[PDB]
Paper text:
In order to identify novel CARF effectors, we used Foldseek18 to search for proteins with structural homology to CARF domain of the Cam1 effector. This method rendered a 600-residue protein containing an N-terminal CARF domain followed by a linker region and a C-terminal adenosine deaminase (ADA) domain, with accession number HAJ98955.1 from an unknown Bacteriodales bacterium (hereafter named CRISPR-associated deaminase, CRISPR-associated adenosine deaminase 1 [Cad1]), for which homologs were already identified in a previous bioinformatic screen. cad1 is located immediately downstream the cas10-csm genes of a type III-A CRISPR locus. Further analysis of cad1 homologs showed that over 70% associate in genomes containing type III systems (mostly belonging to the A and B subtypes) and exist within many unique phyla of bacteria. These data suggest that Cad1 is a widespread effector in type III CRISPR-Cas systems. Altogether, these data demonstrate that Cad1 deaminates ATP molecules to ITP through the formation of an hexameric complex that requires a Mg+2 or Mn+2 cofactor and an activating cA4 or cA6 ligand. While the triggering of a growth arrest in the host is a common strategy of all CARF effectors, we believe that Cad1 introduces a new mode of defense for CRISPR-Cas systems that couples nucleotide deamination activity to a sequence-specific, RNA-guided adaptive immune response.
Next, we used X-ray crystallography to elucidate the molecular details of cOA interactions with Cad1’s CARF domain. We first solved the crystal structure of apo-Cad1-CARF-His6 at 3.6 Å resolution. The structure showed an asymmetric unit composed of a tetramer formed by crystal packing between two Cad1-CARF-His6 dimers in which monomers are arranged in a pseudo-2-fold symmetry. Consistent with these results, SECMALS analysis of Cad1-CARF-His6 showed the formation a stable dimer in solution. Analysis of the electrostatic potential revealed the presence of a positively charged pocket that harbors both K104 residues on top of the C-terminal legs (residues 104–117) on each of the CARF monomers at the dimeric interface. Although both cOA ligands were fully accommodated in the electropositive pocket of apo Cad1-CARF-His6, they affected differently the angle between the two C-terminal legs of the CARF monomers. While cA6 binding produced a minor change (from 58° in the apo structure to 55°), cA4 binding opened this angle to 76°, most likely a consequence of the deep burial of cA4 within the pocket.
Numbering used by the authors:
A (entry chain C): 1 to 166
B (entry chain A): 2 to 166
Write the structure that this text describes.
Amino acid sequence: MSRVLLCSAGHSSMVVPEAFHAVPEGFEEVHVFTTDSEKFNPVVLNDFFHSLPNVRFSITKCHGLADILNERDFEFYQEMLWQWYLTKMPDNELPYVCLSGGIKSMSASLQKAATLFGAQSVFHVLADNNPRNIEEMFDALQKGQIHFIEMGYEPGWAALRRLKKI
Amino acid sequence: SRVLLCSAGHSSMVVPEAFHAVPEGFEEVHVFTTDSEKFNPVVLNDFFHSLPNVRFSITKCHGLADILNERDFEFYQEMLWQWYLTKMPDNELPYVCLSGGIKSMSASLQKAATLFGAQSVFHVLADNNPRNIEEMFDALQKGQIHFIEMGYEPGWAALRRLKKI
């Protein structure tokens, strides 16, 4: 059984190296849903998981969306997010979800998917001085200056999880 | 009565934007903020005094300046859900704006709605980050502020009776 980590990442890609450490045992899968904004930095994350090859790592770009700016873009975003969530979800398990990255309209639609499709532990990650690279986040992990905010198990809907068959 | 409930933090201007993103206006407004120093109540009040046909009530979380660890969020959350059940109408469901505050302020106000009900969980989005009143009324006027509703949350009457303990 696979402890899977689902995330939304924005410009600040450092949030994913911080959500993988916030669960002590570790993780198996790590999937990241981001926009096709050129401000997304794939490099900070492809250096980090290339030192953990026991972690099946993935990044989905929503081709053709960059900045959610009006009502149609969010209707286009929410739907694309909600699809990605059912697929990357494990088949025998609820996933671990991180609400930290992106903009606020990215993160509240992700709260709804976890409540609608289930989530082992919806959680939020806070930091004291905002680490910008891997050393900063490693030495700030070392002095106890990253706290993990848990929000609680989400039972979801077994019926609504069958939607990935259609 | 249509009620508007808003988390607020550093950028105060989300609340007068949330006021105008519902065409008819609001009779009540209630803000739930920490006792931060950065929270500027002055721009809000200056707007909400020019509109004397409304009832405005900020409620400062007395003691909390910032949420930093899992203990400070659980103080925040429990004080938020009382206030959400305090300021909720008796017969109608409130309008909830997830625009101000931090992300754990908004995801908990998010939950609050789903547990108790919310006529409309919405989230106001702008373009240039309006710094003041004249800028916002010019933003509203050039068609740059966006009302992103997210959905009616019917809530649970079996949990709304909980205000009576």
